[PDB]
Amino acid sequence: AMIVKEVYETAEKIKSMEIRGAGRIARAAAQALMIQAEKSKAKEPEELWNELKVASKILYNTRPTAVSLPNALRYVMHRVKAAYLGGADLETLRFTAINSAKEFIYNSEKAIERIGEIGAKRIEDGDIIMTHCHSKAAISVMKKAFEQGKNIKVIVTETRPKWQGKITAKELASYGIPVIYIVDSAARHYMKMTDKVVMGADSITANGAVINKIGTSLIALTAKEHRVWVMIAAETYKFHPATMLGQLVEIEMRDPTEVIPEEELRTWPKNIEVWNPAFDVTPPEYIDVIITERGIIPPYAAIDILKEEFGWALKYKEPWED
Template identity: 80%
Template structure:
């Protein structure tokens, strides 16, 4: 029961970071399952269910840290599994997969809009904001504040080694927002002129800790030192259900050649080891509020979001592992 090439292509793009950003990764994963159902040659409902599970397994193993990916897969496959176990026929099961994927994508896009509305209310006229990496939700907050007529300026860190800050800087500038683009190490230097920090998240744990692009924790620590408010913009599907059970979030380690080009690194002494963690962990005490599409919460309330949104998931194995 083959997985279509479009699913394999999406999986590879997620793995190589051609598709990047937790929200975009999640929507792409859901869309991949939709494509599998739409293009399946399965003759029986059993064959289709096996195809969907195999596609989900392939997608699941692309990036280990961003929980938005497995949460998107769970959204689609859990509903598909319920329908399969209830005796759905082939066409009904296809419909469930396709409709669930479309529903997830729609909800995800609406969540970003809601977060922008909630977050913009906490931005004041004249604010200078610092941000790190690229987050559609965080960018949405700043763009919404600007659209509301608030005169803001944004300091964007470059975000080594993949320079995602360039994406953020260009998006904000295209919206008309004045941008200061700085190296990561300059965050503390510019924090003294910063009023608020707005960043995204790849995963949020039960205790309110935020896993985001490496460097986030240093920006948040510097903000705390300067008594600058730190706001995290994140959809509820970025909350990590397994952390309710005490599971630790795996931090992805990427290729050292992203940090030092191969042709240069190959000439270095062999006792130099280059490490390239993609993410770090920001403790909840460095964060003032988390802005979700549901509400604005303090970090310690993350556990309530997890119980409400994902409590059911803890009772079952992953739908694609059956």
Template identity: 50%
Template sequence: MSVTDTAEKIKSMEVRGAGRIARAAAEALRDHAASVRSSDVAAFRQEMERAAATLVATRPTAVSLPNAVHIVMAGLEHASTTEEAREGLIHRAARFIQSSQHAVEKISGFGARHIRDGDTILTHCNSEVALGCIIEAHRSGKKIEVFATEVRPRNQGLITIRTLNDAGIKTNFIVDSAVRSYIHDVDLVIVGADAVTVNGAVVNKIGTSQVAHTAAEARVSVLVAAETYKFAPQTIMGDLIRIEEREANEVLADEIARTLPNVTVRNPAFDVTPAEYIDLIVTEQGAIPPQMAYIIIREYLGWGIEEFHESIGIGANHDE
């Protein structure tokens, strides 16, 4: 799929979920690198940087996207020929995609260990890794039940309940505002993440913070499933994660909105859950308390980018 098509599908949420977005961006850059026929390495680099910028601009909150692009693009400036640059980028994209898929498998296994036989789990939004934990627990023979939220206004919960249904897991489908009504029937909350900050706060689908606050009030543990490339190195320097606000017509049809001139529709796509409402963050490197987010960033991202490259099989011999 072309960079333009991929960017449009990410922006319109046809491709959704932080991990899927990251892999789609890596695939688009890989395919674009293969199609660019310039023999001038500077022109090739410039074209790839343009493509990367197009992809990164689509979803400002999902940190997985710029992190994936950064990993795939790393080393271009050291290439002396177009072929060297092309081969290096294609190699890094392939390794990132493979690493991302393996991360989902590892997190599913780690997360499933925190689910007990007989547990009732609540999940919000449609997280590949959060669902992976639940499905892996079910596959291991644990008898579990799930409460899944509707997830207004995009109704990602419909994807979640189809996935759970197909896996043979007993599931209750509830509107977002019913979480408090059922929280005392729940043993564990499992959600995904679009970004994890240096202080352990989690940026995820709007409504996550309310779920976590309700769980804390009811003394129900909250587990966040997140690959290491969803941690945000820029927050070390004090940068904030920009919360994407989407089109009003996702909430209120244009023809209705036109009849309400004094009404402004606000549609933030994400919110921030403070670290104190989170018990564990499960990554492919293991489960950590949110207060250890800095360690993940230091060792695998940001200042520790070389170590992160090594952890997914990208060594200096491939990049220089």
């Protein structure tokens, strides 16, 4: 097949984390399959069906842990596939794909704003919120509370290795919101002054567990220790279907040099391995609520979300396999 440069570029930028955050990655992936259909030179349906099957594969093998990614691809390709198998002519298939992808992206933007409006009602005036990493969903909650005239402060953890915390700090500060920036080690120390914890998700499992940025389970643990509510702001497409049938989520191991720079690590002894997991898994008992765009749920209700929105596709193969 013949793939546009924007599919390859998006894939490179996902791997390299130049494009990041699970929501954004998912949009970008959908935006890429969309450009593959805008610019395709295919002459018959099957040509295009193949181009999109292969673009999807390229995009799926970028970063494993956030299921937002394959859900975006599935949203586009369940539709694209059903068009092709119902003999849609070429231009019918091109629109299915473009339009499916415009839907997903639009709904993504809609879901986040909505998560913001819902989750803000759980923020009280004077609250001190602790967050982790950079999460567009968590930030929608925090930003919306602030706009309601609640007087909040946000404790931003710096989030090693990759410093996502700086993005979070600067962003919140530019909306007017007072920020307190601390190291990830300082979470328990400052949990006493924290009223709420608000974080994102990359994958939510059938049984309620939240895969999110490494260190998430620690902040959640000590929030529980102190009875601070842990609220996970997370779209429906963050929920992981394959977990319904027994699958464990893959925990992405990133390059050691994100931790110790190349210039330095090459000088270190050989009997030191550097391990850089990108995510950990917080158990549901440490979670108060998941704020989805369909409303507040307890974490154990993740399986209802999956039953009714994702269950069907499990008896089928992936809509890009052959």
